[PDB]
Design a protein around this ligand. Sequence first.
Ligand SMILES: [Cl-]
Ligand SMILES: [Cl-]
Ligand SMILES: [Cl-]
Ligand SMILES: [Cl-]
Length: 251
Amino acid sequence: SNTQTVLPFTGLNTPSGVAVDSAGTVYVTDHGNNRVVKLAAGSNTQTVLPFTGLNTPSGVAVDSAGTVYVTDHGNNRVVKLAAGSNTQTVLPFTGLNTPSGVAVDSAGTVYVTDHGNNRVVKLAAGSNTQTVLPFTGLNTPSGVAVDSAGTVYVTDHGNNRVVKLAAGSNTQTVLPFTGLNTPSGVAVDSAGTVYVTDHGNNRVVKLAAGSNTQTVLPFTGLNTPSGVAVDSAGTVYVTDHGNNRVVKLAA
Ligand SMILES: [Cl-]
Ligand SMILES: [Cl-]
Ligand SMILES: [Cl-]
Ligand SMILES: [Cl-]
């Protein structure tokens, strides 16, 4: 599609992350209002998720159980809320510094871009022991995504590039995007196509698995886009950060 739609959220303030679940419900970190909002497909009435004490939250993810995970950026912590629960829990990460993105794989492993420490950390389901992933040379990494094969994709924000690590690998590779400015968000769909918010160029770009030629998606009028998600139908959702809105484009 080249007809973008603005989702009917209301009262957003410089939103920062977006996630979409298997039913098409959209979840947004409403960064400047210290809250997380949720909108079912076809609804025009958002709700606010009952997180507690968030400080300029940045990243959001939703797992197969519908549990919502948020990087509570200003509190140096990651929290999660089971669907229909009113009580969040704090995940047992250690040493985080303004965390910025979060992803969860099919095994429940939680991946976090530990932004201010230039690293990516992960926690397995039920574990208290985080691991630092063997990326190298990251500058203020800003988004993370993980595909069905366990390959981890990271927007290396300060180095204008996207890197990936295959499961079990100790050596990253750089994806062949071109011309990125301070990339923020990243998403990967079931076919392995990688979508990136090219933050400083006000555009969203994508790269099919095996391709060396990116495509620019036909969004218009974006301002410093900040997060991206893709649903099972291939619809791409972007937090249009500087325009206080969320926009989508069917494939
Ligand atoms: Cl901001
Ligand atoms: Cl901030
Ligand atoms: Cl930064
Ligand atoms: Cl910005």
